[PDB]
Amino acid sequence: XXXXXXXXXXXXXXXXXXSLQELKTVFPHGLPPRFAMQVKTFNEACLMVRKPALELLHYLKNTNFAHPAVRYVLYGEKGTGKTLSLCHILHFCAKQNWLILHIPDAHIWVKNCRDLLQSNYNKQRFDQPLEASTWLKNFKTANEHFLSQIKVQEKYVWNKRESTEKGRPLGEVVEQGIMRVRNATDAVGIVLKELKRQSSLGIFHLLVAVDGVNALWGRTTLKREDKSPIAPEELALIHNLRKMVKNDWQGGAIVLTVSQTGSLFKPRNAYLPQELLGKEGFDALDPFIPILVSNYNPKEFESCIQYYLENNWLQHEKAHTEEGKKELLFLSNRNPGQLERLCAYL
Amino acid sequence: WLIKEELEEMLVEKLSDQDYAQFIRLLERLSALPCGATEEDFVNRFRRSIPXXXXXXXXXXXXXXXXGMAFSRGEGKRKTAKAEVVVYGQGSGRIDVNGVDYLLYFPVTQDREQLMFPLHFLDRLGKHDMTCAVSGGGRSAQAGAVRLAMARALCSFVTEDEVEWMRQAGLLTADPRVRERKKPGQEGARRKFTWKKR
Ligand SMILES: Nc1nc2c(ncn2[C@@H]2O[C@H](COP(=O)(O)OP(=O)(O)O)[C@@H](O)[C@H]2O)c(=O)[nH]1
Numbered sequence: 001x002x003x004x005x006x007x008x009x010x011x012x013x014x015x016x017x018x019s020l021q022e023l024k025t026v027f028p029h030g031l032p033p034r035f036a037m038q039v040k041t042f043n044e045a046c047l048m049v050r051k052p053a054l055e056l057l058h059y060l061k062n063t064n065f066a067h068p069a070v071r072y073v074l075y076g077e078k079g080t081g082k083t084l085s086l087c088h089i090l091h092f093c094a095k096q097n098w099l100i101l102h103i104p105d106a107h108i109w110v111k112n113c114r115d116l117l118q119s120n121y122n123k124q125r126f127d128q129p130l131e132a133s134t135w136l137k138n139f140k141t142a143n144e145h146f147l148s149q150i151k152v153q154e155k156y157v158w159n160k161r162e163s164t165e166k167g168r169p170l171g172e173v174v175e176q177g178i179m180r181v182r183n184a185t186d187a188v189g190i191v192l193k194e195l196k197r198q199s200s201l202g203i204f205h206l207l208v209a210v211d212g213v214n215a216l217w218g219r220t221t222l223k224r225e226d227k228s229p230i231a232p233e234e235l236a237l238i239h240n241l242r243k244m245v246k247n248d249w250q251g252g253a254i255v256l257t258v259s260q261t262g263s264l265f266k267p268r269n270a271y272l273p274q275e276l277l278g279k280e281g282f283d284a285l286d287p288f289i290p291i292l293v294s295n296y297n298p299k300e301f302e303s304c305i306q307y308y309l310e311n312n313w314l315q316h317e318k319a320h321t322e323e324g325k326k327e328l329l330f331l332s333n334r335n336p337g338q339l340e341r342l343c344a345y346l
Numbered sequence: 347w348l349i350k351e352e353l354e355e356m357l358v359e360k361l362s363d364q365d366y367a368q369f370i371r372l373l374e375r376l377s378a379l380p381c382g383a384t385e386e387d388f389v390n391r392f393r394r395s396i397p398x399x400x401x402x403x404x405x406x407x408x409x410x411x412x413x414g415m416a417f418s419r420g421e422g423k424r425k426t427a428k429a430e431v432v433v434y435g436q437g438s439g440r441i442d443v444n445g446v447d448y449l450l451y452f453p454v455t456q457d458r459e460q461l462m463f464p465l466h467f468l469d470r471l472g473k474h475d476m477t478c479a480v481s482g483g484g485r486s487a488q489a490g491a492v493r494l495a496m497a498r499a500l501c502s503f504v505t506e507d508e509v510e511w512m513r514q515a516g517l518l519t520a521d522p523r524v525r526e527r528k529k530p531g532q533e534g535a536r537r538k539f540t541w542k543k544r
Pocket residue numbers: 032034035038046047048049050076077078079080081082083084085261304336337340
């Protein structure tokens with residue numbers, strides 16, 4: 001299927017490609033691991049375009065940066081393809097030369113943190129250096145041009161012996177937060193608040209993409225040495241990140257996603273926004289655009305099969321028949337994540 | 347021919363196997379020649395007749411009043427698990443289980459394969475639309491019950507010939523296999539406490 005760049009309407013269910021340098025540039029952060037497999041396997045980065053992706057992109061074409069920050073939501077069944085329908089957006093508006101703030105899984109913040117550091121600067125907030133540092137190290141390669149341009153107007157204190165005073169390029173702040181890892185989180189929050197402050201200017205076009213928003217108000221796994229569980233409130237990273245969904249600001253766009261897979265305490269089958277977010281989440285999330293994500297339709301499906309045949313990735317003999325199509329259709333219920341797996345061993 | 351017990355009843359006489367055998371042997375000699383009228387009557391005395399019946403019983407279809415459409419409702423039962431499956435003759439391929447989709451209700455691939463069996467057999471895979479209610483037991487048991495119920499509800503919409511195929515595929519026959527009760531003084535109904543020679 002034929003393509004050039006992300007935005008075309010009639011190209012629904014066609015194959016968009018990107019380069020490897022385009023890939024290291026646009027997704028320094030994680031790309032969905034199954035798809036990183038796809039890419040490292042086929043040497044080619046390839047994708048198809050879906051009706052919700054089209055819809056979302058056309059909403060992003062009509063955007064007014066004078067208007068307050070607009071929230072979007074991608075919801076759907078497990079492995080229904082909602083995290084990649086985030087990346088479509090990502091490289092589109094990154095090729096439009098915007099600020100791309102991408103957190104691939106919020107859940108990695110709320111769960112499995114080796115080192116919980118206590119910081120009372122923020123009045124009982126905990127910082128997670130491991131995550132902060134990784135996130136910053138990707139964000140560096142994310143947007144390079146914009147990092148030297150931004151001039152932060154603030155005074156900031158890292159240490160008694162260390163400080164940075166206003167008139168500094170932002171990239172400086174970032175890489176100085178990476179070098180000294182213990183305070184990396186503080187620098188993350190700082191980068192964040194000043195990002196939102198500078199978004200008032202026409203220099204910042206901000207796309208804030210947080211996948212697994214449910215993590216923000218959800219119940220947390222991490223614990224104090226008293227065995228007492230800690231709120232999502234108590235996390236420096238999260239407390240600061242909620243501030244970035246708040247719709248208080250201009251020039252930005254926030255695309256969001258509600259996961260099942262990475263979540264905590266939620267049942268396996270709940271793909272509906274109000275469940276995953278809960279009361280606090282939904283309420284604190286304000287009017288948003290609830291974009292449903294669903295299974296491949298027949299056309300997208302025979303398209304996916306077309307594509308897999310094209311790469312000779314189906315190595316089974318009888319895979320070429322209409323028989324093979326009917327089998328894979330019925331076993332997958334033509335679900336993107338399911339078909340991915342049915343082909344992997346086929 | 348009569349059993350030994352039936353000749354014993356006919357003559358009001360205890361018999362021996364050898365004797366019975368001798369006689370029946372003689373009746374074969376009789377049948378071996380040209381058969382007269384009274385000859386045939388004579389051997390008819392010692393004749394009996396037996397029934398044999400094999401067909402999978404075919405339910406006439408049922409046309410629903412609401413859409414004016416025909417459906418067939420099957421019931422499978424396997425191993426603590428019963429399932430009921432209503433199959434609609436004009437489908438989108440939709441298959442619903444207990445009010446949720448079949449992919450979600452059988453995350454185990456194996457199960458979905460079991461489900462696929464009858465439909466892939468009869469090449470009807472997209473053609474039919476099924477509603478399903480299943481209860482009892484664990485997942486494989488359930489998927490198998492649905493297999494039986496479905497393959498039963500699929501013989502209204504199939505040809506009279508494909509039926510004998512589904513029999514020889516073993517789709518419509520229940521699974522007699524079930525758990526065997528532990529026995530007291532043993533372990534696992536078969537497994538025994540370790541036996542000691544000394
Ligand atoms: N061809 C194609 N594949 C996709 C697309 N979106 C997702 N996939 C694949 O389908 C799988 C499921 O997508 P994902 O967003 O991770 O589902 P999630 O687990 O519900 O978030 C991924 O491994 C992708 O490789 C798409 O737009 N086109």
